[PDB]
Amino acid sequence: GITRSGSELITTLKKNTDTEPKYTTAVLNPSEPGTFNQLIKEAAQYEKYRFTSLRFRYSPMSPSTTGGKVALAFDRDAAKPPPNDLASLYNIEGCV
Amino acid sequence: GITRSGSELITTLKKNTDTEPKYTTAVLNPSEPGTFNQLIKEAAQYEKYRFTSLRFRYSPMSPSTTGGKVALAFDRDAAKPPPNDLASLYNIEGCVSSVPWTGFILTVPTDSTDRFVADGISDPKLVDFGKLIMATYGQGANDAAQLGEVRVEYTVQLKNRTGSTSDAQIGDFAGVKDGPRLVSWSKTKGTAGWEHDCHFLGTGNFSLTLFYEKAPVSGLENADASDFSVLGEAAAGSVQWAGVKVAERGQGVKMVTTEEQPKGKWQALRI
Amino acid sequence: TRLSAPVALAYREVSTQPRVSTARDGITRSGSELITTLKKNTDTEPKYTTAVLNPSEPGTFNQLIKEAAQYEKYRFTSLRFRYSPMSPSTTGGKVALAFDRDAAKPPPNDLASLYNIEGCVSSVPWTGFILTVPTDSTDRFVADGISDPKLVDFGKLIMATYGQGANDAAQLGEVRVEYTVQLKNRTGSTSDAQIGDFAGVKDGPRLVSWSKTKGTAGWEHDCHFLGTGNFSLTLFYEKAPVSGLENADASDFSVLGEAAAGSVQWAGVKVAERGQGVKMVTTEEQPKGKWQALRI
Amino acid sequence: TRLSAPVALAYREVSTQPRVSTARDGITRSGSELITTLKKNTDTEPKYTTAVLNPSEPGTFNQLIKEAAQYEKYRFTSLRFRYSPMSPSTTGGKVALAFDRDAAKPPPNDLASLYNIEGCVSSVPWTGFILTVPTDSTDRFVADGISDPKLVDFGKLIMATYGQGANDAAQLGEVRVEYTVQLKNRTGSTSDAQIGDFAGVKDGPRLVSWSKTKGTAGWEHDCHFLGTGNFSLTLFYEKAPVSGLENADASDFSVLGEAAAGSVQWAGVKVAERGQGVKMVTTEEQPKGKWQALRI
């Protein structure tokens, strides 16, 4: 048994001129290179996990004169394709 | 902060058929590849530690008809060289010895001070918690090849946190080296020319990649490694990729250039 | 009735903690040390290995030597030797421990005489036994130079092995002292580095024992080391010798120096078994010079 | 009211008995030692004499060094220095004792700074005073080689004298330690003979401190001896030096050897006051060789 806490960096979002959302997903498993860059090394030594706590912080980097929007949502199914319209995106529980 | 108890295999002691006892040491630091094979990965991401509980175990592997003895002592000064005579070893505090065919334990009292995870260039008296001394002596020619295995059952408290240290030890021929201390090079002039040979401080399957700016005298060659297989091509401006299996510390490979400090680059990994 | 025989016996040895204390006249130190490991002897007659019982004796004591350098007299209030087997139960021969109260008399020459010594115990190599020697109430001077061993030394332990087969364990066991000494008086701390010339002068702990032997090339002086460990030996020749320092039967001998008039050598000898040493050759019996043994 | 002034004060000093005892982790040794005797200084500015507080320091401790050679860590549970006057009441000037918790910082340069040190006591040369230094609960490694003094040394005592007249007592007093150390851990007895090359390597008790200084003839290496007593110094030159060993400011210096490639010298230096030493000259900065200091 072991309990660890961390704060990784998933990715940096990019501008999208088109008014339709452009999605970029990130599967949430400890042994996922796309999501975790440091937890993978210690997850390779274990074969089970349980996320006691979990949060996703968006830290702005753009000037104050940039429009558009940025949305973070959590889909409890890791195989479902990302939604195809804004309404479906906002229907996801907890989307902010 | 993170507490990580566990148990790991340091090495397996081997027959000492000669008369002088043989001493093998393993510095007790979480970043030492000689003693740790799994806690090193976790300690790469932390820059402080404290051994809440430490203890060593000897598991027999030899027949019941094996002579000689094996000893296990802990020295709190990681800088001191290994003892020179058996009496001094047996004078160390808490030194436990027994016949090879029976197992024993050695509990190490631990203090409540924090030390920086080793970087390889700092004073051992400042970073390391101590070292372990394993002695084997008094074995005849009819004894088994292997006597037993030494293991460490610990409980460490890694503190703070930082950027993960590189898993591969990149370096440069006769120059700078970065990453975990997996290998160490040495040079000795010879008939053909300057001979550069590396020694693997850890035990396991490695992967050594090399790059020659100028054509060397000879390519990678087994020196005393258990297994070996090169898949490159020695030549000017080429790279040689090799896989070396190490059973005991100090085994490695070699090369020849005839030019001291040749221009190139090497990479070591524990696959 | 029935009495079984194991394949082997395992003794667990843990380094205990010395018990030091202060008395009216001095201190009373108790502890345990390791003398040596007995080796196989595939011959009927015994082969001996001696260890003089006296604090400040590097061969016998390793830690009590330092604590006895600050004191002048001693009295072994209780000492006792123990044997730990490390050989299977299929090893023949025997192991004998005896305590000779005269520290100069050479070990006996035949097995019959070895058993006449009072208190001589013995047993099979694969079992442990203890030899406890009665002590007395006489104070003796800690060894400091060339003096009669009858006057300073308390005694001498004798360890013998014999009767082992050809295909037997290389080493049979190891002896271990268990003393309780009474150090008395006090003095300025004394250095530990035997120093003396070739005319029979010695000043310090007994680390070396020279021995002349006439030869065709010249008188050969053999520097036998009583202990086992790493030593250094500086020599100063007043007259040019036949040869410098050479490795006689020791292990890992290295010398930095030259042989000539007024020259000085410096040999880092290393000893794996008590008795090994180096040698030198000169044309002059009892040559003029100096030497200095140290435990480095 | 009235307060008389004697012609002189007599302190009776009797060598007490060290109190050794055994604890769970090690031993607890109490005792008293003599550091040095202060000398007259007929100048307004101070003249300093330092003594590093650490067991296995030959300059400071004479008997605790031997008892600390068997142990690895220490903790001064209680230490305190005392001053015994041996000068009449007609001597001017002053005597100052201070304890610098940093063992590498050089002694101050002016009297004003000397009095800013915490705990700095002082008095007239003809009366006795005690400086008691608060201790802590941190274990430190007994000195074993070249290491940062911040990490191993507990501190450094500083003794200063100044303001004495021309026709005053030659020596004013003498300092005396009174410690209670807690030695812990344990290890095979370590030899007492500093050994190291000229590249900055040292292994053993701090008996010597080399110091380069560029000169017209070549780089001069001065072998300053931190203690006071009889020493021996073996040197090995790999390359022929400009000159061998010469007496710089010590007393009774004698050397048996020659200066040349591969040659070895052997100097029995004698020191009457801490800091005296010998010297040698070479044309190569950081020369290749070895040296070995010993207390013989």
Curated annotation (Swiss-Prot), chain A:
Chain's role: Capsid protein self-assembles to form an icosahedral capsid with a T=3 symmetry, about 32-35 nm in diameter, and consisting of 180 capsid proteins. Also acts as a suppressor of RNA-mediated gene silencing known as post-transcriptional gene silencing (PTGS), a mechanism of plant viral defense that limits the accumulation of viral RNAs. May suppress other innate immunity by binding to host TIP protein, thereby preventing it to migrate in the nucleus where it could trigger an antiviral response.
GO annotations of cellular component type: T=3 icosahedral viral capsid
Gene Ontology BP terms: symbiont-mediated suppression of host innate immune response
Organism: Turnip crinkle virus
Any one GO MF annotation of this record: structural molecule activity
Section covered of the full-length record: 81 to 176 of 351
Full protein name: Capsid protein
Subunit comment: Homodimer. Homomultimer. Interacts (via GW motifs) with Arabidopsis thaliana AGO1 and AGO4; these interactions inhibit RNA silencing ability of host AGOs. Interacts with host TIP.
Keyword Calcium: yes
Domain of life: Viruses
Sequence segments annotated as region (S domain, virion shell): 2-96
Subcellular compartments: Virion
Major place of residence: virion
Family of this protein: Belongs to the icosahedral plant coat protein family.
